[PDB]
Amino acid sequence: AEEWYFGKITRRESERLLLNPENPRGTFLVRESETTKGAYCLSVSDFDNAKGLNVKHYKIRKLDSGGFYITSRTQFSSLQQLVAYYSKHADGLCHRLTNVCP
């Protein structure tokens, strides 16, 4: 029911969705590996004058002790905590997460 979770959408279909010019910087979605349940990626739209509209994909790593992270220095207890956090602060990303991908 998470507006931003798109299940097993492929990398290519996720870029086609996110690359739409009406998506503001930071539009994003979370997707899952097709084979590995629980293995997630955060796909996000961005823009700069070098690459123009582009999509960045971050593997959402899992610690053995449980937990999720896209950069090891910032650990979360769940996907919702992580998405909530980067929606408030870029904290290293080029831009904070904004619109859930439509």
Partner: peptide, 7 residues
């Protein structure tokens, strides 16, 4: 292909 990363 490729997976972004940041410090």
């Amino acid at each position: 292909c490729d997976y972004a990363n940041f410090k």
